[PDB]
Design a protein around this ligand. Sequence first.
Ligand SMILES: *[P@@](=O)(CCCCC/C=C\C/C=C\C/C=C\CCCCC)OC
Length: 275
Amino acid sequence: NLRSLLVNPEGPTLMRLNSVQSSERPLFLVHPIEGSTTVFHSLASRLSIPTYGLQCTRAAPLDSIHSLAAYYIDCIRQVQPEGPYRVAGYSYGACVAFEMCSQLQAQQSPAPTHNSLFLFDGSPTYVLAYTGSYRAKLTPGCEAEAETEAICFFVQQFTDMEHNRVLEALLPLKGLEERVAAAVDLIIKSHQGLDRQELSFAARSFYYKLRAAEQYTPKAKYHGNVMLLRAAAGADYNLSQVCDGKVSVHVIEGDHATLLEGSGLESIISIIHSS
Ligand SMILES: *[P@@](=O)(CCCCC/C=C\C/C=C\C/C=C\CCCCC)OC
């Protein structure tokens, strides 16, 4: 459903995803690349702990994953001022969640830290694998081509349009803003009822989200423990390279998308409740 690929750019960053009321510290869930928390609805409805989502709105600083993570920590502190924190992220959000817990590690130091980090099918290197495959198609150092490729991909998620006619429409344009405007007009032609400003924000932010992920490396190894629940990047999605604590891995049924529903979901729920 296409509006699941959209965010209200003026919506709240932190959102309560279930109605559990207790003194148990909440679980905070970080969005996948599209920025919305829709993918977490089934999980949140089932969890017995208060559950919040983080969505990516116009207010989010996207200059780096470092900045995005710091902003999300500021947001979480409006409901839970002190740790320890329970944070999970899915896909693109796994890298953000990793960086959030890394910043929490470094902030609560030198005191021993006890945060819980769950990565649902992602890691600091997970997005990079995707971006490199597309970079392979492009003239080195040509920003215009990278913008074009990203925005073309975006259009193809919202329309049945053929790749080359969209690429060719976007390539010669003046800059990102013109590419975004062209993309939104193409999507609106197909889907007249979608919101123009939601689409514009989604398109622009898609490019900046990808740039931030491409440029990201952790500042230091994470010393806390990590639970990877996953569907080359290898068995642990390269986490041993950036973690000096325990990296526990469990393989969940489904693909990169269905793991948060059906069978995968039952496993995730069980592991959250135990660990
Ligand atoms: P997850 O959040 C998926 C995480 C990976 C998302 C990236 C997937 C595809 C990238 C598509 C196009 C990028 C093309 C341009 C290459 C240059 C990069 C631009 C900065 O699950 C939803």
